[PDB]
């Protein structure tokens, strides 16, 4: 980010963000539960259960 | 003895090179480039 202006200033811009567009359809956080969850995304049909 | 032109030489490439290199410090090696910019939250 220091590297370059454009990079570091991207990394203050979301640094100060509350929130905008930080948008978690994926994250720093993982657990296998993200691919288990993942997997029931993918198979298939979506449904209730 | 023996029986020379002015001709036997090429053996200081290196030096040259080196030369140029320095010159090349002095600027750069063909010409001077220019940089790259970034992009936000797709970041």
Redesign the interface.
Same mark, same amino acid.
């Given at each position: 980010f220091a590297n370059?202006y454009? #990079?570091w +200033? +991207?990394?203050q811009?979301?640094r100060m963000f509350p929130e905008? #567009?930080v948008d978690p359809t994926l994250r720093l956080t993982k657990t296998e539960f993200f691919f288990q969850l993942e997997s029931a995304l993918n198979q298939g049909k979506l449904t209730d259960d | 003895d023996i029986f020379m032109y002015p001709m036997n030489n090429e053996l200081r490439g290196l030096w040259d090179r080196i030369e140029n290199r320095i010159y090349n410090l002095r600027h750069n090696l063909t010409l001077d480039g220019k940089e790259i910019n970034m992009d936000l939250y797709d970041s």
């Open positions: 370059r454009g #990079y +200033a +991207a990394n811009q979301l905008i #567009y | -």
